[PDB]
Design an enzyme around this catalytic site. Structure first.
Site, mmCIF file in Angstrom:
data_model
loop_
_atom_site.group_PDB
_atom_site.id
_atom_site.type_symbol
_atom_site.label_atom_id
_atom_site.label_comp_id
_atom_site.label_asym_id
_atom_site.label_seq_id
_atom_site.Cartn_x
_atom_site.Cartn_y
_atom_site.Cartn_z
ATOM 1 N N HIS A 61 -69.975 61.589 -131.508
ATOM 2 C CA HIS A 61 -68.726 62.103 -131.477
ATOM 3 C C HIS A 61 -68.295 62.289 -129.890
ATOM 4 O O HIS A 61 -67.365 61.900 -129.525
ATOM 5 C CB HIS A 61 -68.541 63.457 -132.151
ATOM 6 C CG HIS A 61 -68.780 63.338 -133.633
ATOM 7 N ND1 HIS A 61 -67.759 62.665 -134.394
ATOM 8 C CD2 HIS A 61 -69.583 63.877 -134.381
ATOM 9 C CE1 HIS A 61 -68.242 63.003 -135.792
ATOM 10 N NE2 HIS A 61 -69.414 63.731 -135.640
ATOM 11 N N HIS A 91 -70.830 69.304 -122.785
ATOM 12 C CA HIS A 91 -70.307 68.214 -123.324
ATOM 13 C C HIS A 91 -68.798 67.864 -122.468
ATOM 14 O O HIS A 91 -68.572 68.841 -122.184
ATOM 15 C CB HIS A 91 -70.105 68.114 -124.805
ATOM 16 C CG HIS A 91 -69.274 69.099 -125.344
ATOM 17 N ND1 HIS A 91 -69.665 70.256 -125.813
ATOM 18 C CD2 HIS A 91 -68.057 69.060 -125.812
ATOM 19 C CE1 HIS A 91 -68.560 70.933 -126.219
ATOM 20 N NE2 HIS A 91 -67.542 70.054 -126.376
ATOM 21 N N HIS A 93 -64.825 65.651 -123.169
ATOM 22 C CA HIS A 93 -63.883 65.278 -124.297
ATOM 23 C C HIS A 93 -63.116 64.290 -123.321
ATOM 24 O O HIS A 93 -62.739 64.813 -122.130
ATOM 25 C CB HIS A 93 -63.033 66.226 -124.932
ATOM 26 C CG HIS A 93 -63.586 67.215 -125.759
ATOM 27 N ND1 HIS A 93 -63.810 66.869 -127.072
ATOM 28 C CD2 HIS A 93 -64.131 68.392 -125.413
ATOM 29 C CE1 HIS A 93 -64.715 68.090 -127.460
ATOM 30 N NE2 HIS A 93 -64.840 68.767 -126.548
ATOM 31 N N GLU A 103 -58.561 68.627 -124.189
ATOM 32 C CA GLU A 103 -58.344 69.351 -125.157
ATOM 33 C C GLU A 103 -56.905 70.443 -125.134
ATOM 34 O O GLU A 103 -56.075 70.216 -125.566
ATOM 35 C CB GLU A 103 -59.376 69.889 -125.990
ATOM 36 C CG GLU A 103 -60.348 68.925 -126.396
ATOM 37 C CD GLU A 103 -61.406 69.331 -127.366
ATOM 38 O OE1 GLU A 103 -61.655 70.373 -127.392
ATOM 39 O OE2 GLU A 103 -61.247 68.589 -128.550
ATOM 40 N N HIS A 116 -66.793 71.279 -121.217
ATOM 41 C CA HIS A 116 -67.052 72.336 -121.940
ATOM 42 C C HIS A 116 -68.336 73.080 -121.834
ATOM 43 O O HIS A 116 -69.459 72.030 -122.192
ATOM 44 C CB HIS A 116 -66.663 72.321 -123.665
ATOM 45 C CG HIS A 116 -65.323 72.151 -123.807
ATOM 46 N ND1 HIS A 116 -64.695 71.443 -124.970
ATOM 47 C CD2 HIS A 116 -64.045 72.570 -122.853
ATOM 48 C CE1 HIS A 116 -63.437 71.448 -124.988
ATOM 49 N NE2 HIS A 116 -63.165 72.132 -123.880
ATOM 50 N N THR A 195 -63.645 73.470 -131.359
ATOM 51 C CA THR A 195 -62.636 72.283 -131.518
ATOM 52 C C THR A 195 -63.078 70.982 -132.276
ATOM 53 O O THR A 195 -62.413 70.077 -132.185
ATOM 54 C CB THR A 195 -62.056 71.867 -130.002
ATOM 55 O OG1 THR A 195 -63.212 70.853 -129.445
ATOM 56 C CG2 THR A 195 -61.555 72.927 -129.154
#
Ligand SMILES: NS(=O)(=O)c1c(F)c(F)c(SCCO)c(F)c1NC1CCCCCCC1
Ligand SMILES: [Zn+2]
Length: 257
Positions: A61, A91, A93, A103, A116, A195
């Site tokens: 992911h 991590h 995104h 996000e 994050h 999330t």
């Protein structure tokens, strides 16, 4: 299983995790004009002096750098928080292109990525327990825009070729997360959720106003990761972001202005 694709992405998650349609889901769009300046909010205290990074994993992911959180070593406090939150992992995104990937959004603007830093409230003893509580986690979110390189990110990017596909991990010691932080700790804060599944409504979000700069070369290395396991058709790990969710009955507070 869930993921980020057309048949298993964010619009599907509510089938397995009904909380996806809940009252305090994340991320959200941060309306800067509507966020209330709260002179009661405290400066955020980030104490990352003794952090001990341990490992980095590609879980299919994203990738996560996990820390030793078996004693207060890297803690967040102050800000909107009561109590002490220990850092367990960070991590990112990111997008397929520089105009998407974050996000949270700011007046609908998307950033190229979002970092994050995930912390759990020590009053709950362990991160699993903490995730069951409405004040269990605090996630510090930092936007990334593309321009000048972030030198403190380079040690992360240079290790990504070793974890290209789902399931691959590596030892990752002595990484200092202070090198990922912008100058200012001005922030927005609101009550929200994880999330990704299970989407628990256990997070106090703290989103910094000031992005960090990363280079195009740095984000190109994020986009070379794969969602798939080795041997499966190749799918570039990109667009691993959940879109903004309804704000519902929440106010976003600003530490500044
Ligand atoms: N995005 S986030 O910061 O709200 C976040 C947490 F706060 C968490 F505490 C966790 S761990 C609990 C879920 O099993 C999390 F997975 C994510 N999300 C994951 C991003 C999706 C890719 C998986 C890598 C782990 C972080
Ligand atoms: Zn995240």
């Amino acid at each position: 299983h869930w993921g980020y694709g057309k048949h298993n992405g964010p619009e599907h998650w509510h089938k397995d995790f009904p909380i996806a349609k809940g009252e305090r889901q994340s991320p959200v769009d941060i309306d800067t004009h509507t966020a209330k300046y709260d002179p009661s909010l405290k400066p955020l205290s980030v104490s990352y002096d003794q952090a001990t990074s341990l490992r980095i994993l590609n879980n299919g992911h994203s990738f996560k750098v996990e820390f030793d959180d078996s004693q207060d070593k890297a803690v967040l406090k102050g800000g909107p928080l009561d109590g002490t939150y220990r850092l367990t992992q960070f991590h990112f995104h990111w997008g397929s292109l520089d105009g998407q990937g974050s996000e949270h959004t700011v007046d609908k603007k998307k950033y190229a990525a979002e970092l994050h830093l995930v912390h759990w409230n020590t009053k709950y003893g362990d991160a699993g327990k903490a995730s069951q509580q409405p004040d269990g986690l605090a996630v510090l979110g930092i936007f990334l825009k593309v321009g000048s390189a972030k030198p403190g990110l380079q040690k992360v990017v240079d290790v990504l070729d070793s974890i290209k596909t789902k399931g691959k991990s590596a030892d990752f010691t002595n990484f200092d997360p202070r090198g990922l932080l912008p100058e200012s700790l001005d922030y927005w804060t609101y009550p929200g959720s994880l999330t990704t599944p299970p989407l628990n409504e256990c997070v106090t979000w703290i989103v910094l106003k000031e992005p960090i700069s990363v280079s195009s070369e740095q984000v190109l290395k994020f986009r070379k990761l794969n969602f798939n396991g080795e041997g499966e058709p190749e799918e570039l790990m990109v667009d691993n972001w959940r879109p903004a969710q309804p704000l519902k009955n929440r106010q976003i507070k600003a530490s500044f202005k």
